[PDB]
Amino acid sequence: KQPQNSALVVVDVQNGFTPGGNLAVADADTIIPTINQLAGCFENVVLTQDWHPDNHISFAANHPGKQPFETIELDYGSQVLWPKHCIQGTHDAEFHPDLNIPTAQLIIRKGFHAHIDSYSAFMEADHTTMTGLTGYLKERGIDTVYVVGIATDFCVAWTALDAVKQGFKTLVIEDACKGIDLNGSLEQAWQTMQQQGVVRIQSTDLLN
Amino acid sequence: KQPQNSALVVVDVQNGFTPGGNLAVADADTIIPTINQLAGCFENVVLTQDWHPDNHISFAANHPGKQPFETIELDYGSQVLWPKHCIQGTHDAEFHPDLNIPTAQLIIRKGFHAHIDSYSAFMEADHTTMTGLTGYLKERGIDTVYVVGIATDFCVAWTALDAVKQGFKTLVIEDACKGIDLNGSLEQAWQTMQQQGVVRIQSTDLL
Numbered sequence: 383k384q385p386q387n388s389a390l391v392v393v394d395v396q397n398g399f400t401p402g403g404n405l406a407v408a409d410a411d412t413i414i415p416t417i418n419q420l421a422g423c424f425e426n427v428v429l430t431q432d433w434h435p436d437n438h439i440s441f442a443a444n445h446p447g448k449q450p451f452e453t454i455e456l457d458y459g460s461q462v463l464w465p466k467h468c469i470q471g472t473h474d475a476e477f478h479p480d481l482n483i484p485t486a487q488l489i490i491r492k493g494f495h496a497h498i499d500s501y502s503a504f505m506e507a508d509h510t511t512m513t514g515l516t517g518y519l520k521e522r523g524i525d526t527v528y529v530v531g532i533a534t535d536f537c538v539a540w541t542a543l544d545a546v547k548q549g550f551k552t553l554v555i556e557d558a559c560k561g562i563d564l565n566g567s568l569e570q571a572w573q574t575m576q577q578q579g580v581v582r583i584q585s586t587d588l589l590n
Numbered sequence: 591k592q593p594q595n596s597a598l599v600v601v602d603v604q605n606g607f608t609p610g611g612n613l614a615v616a617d618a619d620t621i622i623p624t625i626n627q628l629a630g631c632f633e634n635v636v637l638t639q640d641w642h643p644d645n646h647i648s649f650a651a652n653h654p655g656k657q658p659f660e661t662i663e664l665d666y667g668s669q670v671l672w673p674k675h676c677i678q679g680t681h682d683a684e685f686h687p688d689l690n691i692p693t694a695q696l697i698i699r700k701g702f703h704a705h706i707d708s709y710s711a712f713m714e715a716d717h718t719t720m721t722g723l724t725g726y727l728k729e730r731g732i733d734t735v736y737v738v739g740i741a742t743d744f745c746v747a748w749t750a751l752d753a754v755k756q757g758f759k760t761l762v763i764e765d766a767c768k769g770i771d772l773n774g775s776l777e778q779a780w781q782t783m784q785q786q787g788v789v790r791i792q793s794t795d796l797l
């Protein structure tokens with residue numbers, strides 16, 4: 383069992399990002415059993431939820447003339463636009479029915495500001511609005527974060543990279559993640575994470 | 591329309607503490623519509639969930655020869671013993687079906703250490719284990735906390751009192767709360783809360 387100063391952060395294991403959902407990442411449901419097992423290795427487990435209002439600025443539907451998977455320039459920089467997904471209170475937003483972590487101690491929703499996305503569970507896309515997560519973990523005596531979930535190259539990568547920025551020892555458990563790979567995002571995410579000192583590990587490194 | 595520096599904390603609006611549940615507080619379902627309406631006044635809304643393992647020390651069932659509602663002495667002081675309630679993953683632990691706050695931004699579970707209760711969403715019964723809530727709220731720029739839910743004299747009172755300890759301006763919205771009143775606990779929880787400068791308001795004051 384991992385020590386009290388470690389937490390597992392389970393990123394967006396939601397209907398919306400799994401097969402059948404509005405932004406389904408192929409095979410993303412196959413990581414769930416590994417995640418359920420990993421969470422049993424940990425004393426401390428947080429789960430995140432993309433939690434968008436219908437009018438969110440990340441939906442291509444809210445920008446005249448723009449299509450899913452196009453990028454647009456916002457006050458805070460480049461924003462990829464998406465199909466509508468994980469809208470607050472909808473089926474798409476719920477956790478995947480295979481997810482089974484009764485010991486989870488926190489559920490932190492993100493992306494709820496209409497005008498600011500938040501792939502990261504730690505900081506919003508404006509690079510300035512802090513979500514509360516850093517404060518929560520530090521108060522609990524947590525100094526080490528392992529990140530799993532969906533998508534590797536968006537919410538997992540940005541959560542991991544913000545965890546580093548905020549002072550956490552950060553690791554990503556690769557086989558408990560699944561990626562989208564838009565215009566080469568997946569390899570770039572791995573390169574950036576590795577440059578910034580995120581440790582790339584496999585589930586077998588913890589379970590055995 | 592409350593400013594960004596204020597948050598509504600919704601305490602344990604769960605099947606377990608409402609009519610039908612394992613630790614049912616009479617009429618406690620009746621506060622839910624007011625709560626739903628109040629959440630609509632706030633930018634920032636946090637929900638709490640009592641979240642006990644089956645093994646939990648607060649259950650009478652785990653102390654042979656003790657009865658629900660009797661008090662025993664633990665390491666950290668007095669502990670009321672209860673019916674089994676709000677066990678992790680069970681129907682009893684779930685939010686009440688009438689609760690409707692899609693804008694809620696956090697759900698914090700408490701009471702999950704087998705050996706330590708946690709009526710308060712800020713600090714556990716041992717007076718020392720901090721739950722993370724203080725840091726989360728301070729990080730978000732929140733300095734004022736309004737508290738609603740169940741029970742007025744336990745999880746609501748302790749949450750409010752710990753919030754004061756931690757430096758928040760603290761209010762409790764009386765008609766959006768419901769109590770248990772064990773041996774005078776209700777009137778006393780109000781006394782203590784006011785002595786400590788918790789503001790007692792009514793939903794109509796906010797709405």
Ligand SMILES: O=C(O)c1cccnc1
Binds near residue numbers: 394405533534535536
């Ligand atoms: O990585 C995610 O979970 C994600 C991807 C696209 C949009 N919103 C969230």
Ligand SMILES: O=C(O)c1cccnc1
Binds near residue numbers: 709741743744746
């Ligand atoms: O106030 C509460 O929610 C409460 C009351 C008794 C036991 N556990 C929690």
Ligand SMILES: [Zn+2]
Binds near residue numbers: 432434440467468493
């Ligand atoms: Zn999103």
Ligand SMILES: [Zn+2]
Binds near residue numbers: 640642648676701
């Ligand atoms: Zn309890």
